[model samples]
Target: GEYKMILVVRNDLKMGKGKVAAQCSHAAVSAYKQIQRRNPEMLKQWEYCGQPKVVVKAPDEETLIALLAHAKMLGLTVSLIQDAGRTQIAPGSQTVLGIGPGPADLIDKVTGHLKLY
Candidate 1:
């Protein structure tokens, strides 16, 4: 009904669906914690409004990094998944990008062009 979280995933990584799911979950929770630090009223609104989320595709890691930066300066709740690489990929890979449980329209400004995953 109101507010949304956008999970921007890197297509270049070619991660398995299971890995992608895990990474996006990390992104979501991390962003949630960030929001808890700010206006609780906004958070209350978000929860009551259905906790909407979208999974979208970014072409590469570089794009995700920039997206995170863009969202932060634009004042959205932002989080990232820096994989420990205990499993696939290498250590310290920046895996996922997340922006906002903020206003859906504003979050879309940073990620609106990205295609749904």
Candidate 2:
């Protein structure tokens, strides 16, 4: 079973490149924290896969949220991210969505068509 994680960014945010990394960090960690608590064995499998992670893009909040909807139905770990209004964007901006620390086939089924970020 191939294992991986996918970080989906909100392209419409127009976040600076540095800022994207910051957000990606949050999304990835959020996914990790959730999956570790709920499914540690799956997390170990993901680690064996070199902790593979793919970066992809979505149009906006709606797209990411809808993707979360589908990803959840498939039993994949899903993390929907928001900002603190502390830096570039607003306080509650939905910036990224993370799916995985789980099976690649399952994560890909939800985000495979998205372009790389």
Candidate 3:
């Protein structure tokens, strides 16, 4: 597909599968809305491509932020989920990182090495 989104979750946090799933959902929506506001055309292209979304794992918050920085540099729409501490994770903990709904070719350049969650 020409456009897609990737949700990167933290592996070192040891969040439950259910928790990670929820985090991914938040990440996806946050990033999706961001792209919609900043670059509606990209979101439209993504919708046309069937809204491809993927979940992958990174080692820690630092890695998540590093990926966020890299994606930002590439001009991809991005979102980082900071858990509000109402749930399992601590307040302000970065859980999932979202990028793209842009070109998959470019998104892959930022996230290709990470293993799927």
Find the candidate with the highest lDDT and give its number: 3
Question: Which residues of candidate 2, in runs, are more than 4 Å off?
Answer: 87-91
Candidate 2 residue pairs in clash (backbone atoms < 3 Å): 85-91
Tens-place lDDT per residue, model 2, 9-104, is 999889988888888888898889999999999999999989998899999889988999999899888987788655443358898888998788
For candidate 1, write residues 41-110 as lDDT tens digits: 7787788878888899999988988998889888888887878655443458788888889888888889
Q: What is the TM-score of each candidate against the true structure?
A: 0.90, 0.93, 0.92
Better by lDDT, candidate 2 or 1: 2
Q: Lowest summed lDDT over 10 consecutive residues: which window, candidate 2?
A: 82-91
- Candidates by TM-score, descending order: 2, 3, 1
Could you give me the TM-score of model 3 versus the true structure? 0.92
In model 1, the runs with Cα more than 4 Å from the true position are: 87-91
Residue 48 lDDT in model 3? Answer: 96
